[PDB]
């Protein structure tokens, strides 16, 4: 498979490139330049940079879901704050995955084939179901509430991480002005308080 | 003031252009073309398209805050679900403002001057404080919880609206496949269930 390794190599290049300078500015050309192949050859594997990130976003969903479920699978089925804490810690520990969760709705939006979007959403929704099954078992919530929670966690983690990475000079700006104290975002803490309070509000119903 | 009207005219052109085809693809050139002036003249008013949207984002914060506070100002100080409902309805009714709330962390990120970011965050945080004061009065929450709530509402509304507007052909795709049912996002409903449950979980503490 100089084909399955080629694809896996292109993805790692995309990942490490995003780890170095973020994702909202990585080009298909840069990725090609990184893996050392012409853009035309790269295009045989991936139609656009959006399709590359959508596949990395999906790998991120699989990796995060497996991490989250392995941990929830060893928990006492009835502690809201404890479940929220596991969601907050796993997501807070995944900045690239969080950038991709925030960028996704925009990535599949129009420069990706219908069939790729279809596979992506199917793969994604399978993890939502997997994670949801643990929420049902641990806290006894219906399917709707489980989805609301997952959707909330992922969307909120994505937005908090964006707010936390405003650009080097802006981060320095936030810390320098006492009036911008609330602009400094700590992901895990806020995410924990929110998901805990959310899960309790649901459990007390 | 052919200067205050000029600026207000450029913004309306930017707004209506975003209303027509979205924001994640509007260029400084298109805006210039819309208002009928050369790009160089437009640049005298706004350095980049990010500075234009940041100013519209701020106007959006003022407009939304005033709407939200005028309504909360007539409420019975103690109903979590009712407060959540007002947040969900006002935000769900503002798709452009929601796209801008999701795009903001990325807009100020690096192509906007430090001083513009400083003014924007200050203006934004004043509304957070205004809205926060109503949360304190109606539900008796501390400053931290009030910010968590506002941050959650805005970040979640922004993400839900992006998920709800995946592109014409994708929206048709979501509705056509029974397996993608959960991919179809209804903003107000989810936002209401989440903010209500969140506020109760906080109030029950």
UniProtKB/TrEMBL annotation, chains A, B:
GO biological process: regulation of DNA-templated transcription
Gene Ontology terms for molecular function: DNA-binding transcription factor activity; transcription cis-regulatory region binding
PROSITE patterns per the UniProt record, alphabetical: HTH_TETR_2
Gene3D superfamilies named in the record: Tetracycline Repressor, domain 2
Domain HTH tetR-type positions: 4-64
InterPro entries the UniProt entry points to: Homeodomain-like_sf, HTH-type_TetR-like_transc_reg, HTH_TetR, TetR_C_34
Keyword annotations: DNA-binding
Domain of life: Bacteria
Record bears the keyword Nucleotidyltransferase: no
Pfam families hit by this protein: TetR_C_34, TetR_N
DNA-binding annotation, residue ranges on this chain: 27-46
Keyword Cell inner membrane set for record: no
Protein name from the UniProt record: TetR-family transcriptional regulator
């Amino acid at each position: 498979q100089a084909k399955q390794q080629r694809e896996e190599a292109i993805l790692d290049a995309a990942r490490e490139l995003g780890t170095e300078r973020g994702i909202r500015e990585i080009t298909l050309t840069d990725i090609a330049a990184t893996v050392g192949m012409h853009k035309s050859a790269l295009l045989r594997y991936f139609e656009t940079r959006e399709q590359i990130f959508l596949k990395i976003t999906a790998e991120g969903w699989k990796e995060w879901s497996a991490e989250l479920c392995a941990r929830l699978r060893e928990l006492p089925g009835a502690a809201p704050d404890a479940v929220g804490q596991v969601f907050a810690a796993t997501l807070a520990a995944r900045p690239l995955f969080c950038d991709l969760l925030a960028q996704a709705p925009l990535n599949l939006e129009r420069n990706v084939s219908v069939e790729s979007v279809r596979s992506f959403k199917i793969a994604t929704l399978d993890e939502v179901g997997r994670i949801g099954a643990e929420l049902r078992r641990l806290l006894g919530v219906d399917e709707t509430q489980a989805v609301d929670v997952i959707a909330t966690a992922t969307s909120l983690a994505g937005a908090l991480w964006q707010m936390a990475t405003p650009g080097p000079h802006i981060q320095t700006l936030y810390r320098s002005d006492p009036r911008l104290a609330h602009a400094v975002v700590e992901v895990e803490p806020r995410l924990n308080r929110v998901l805990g309070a959310l899960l309790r509000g649901i459990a007390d119903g």
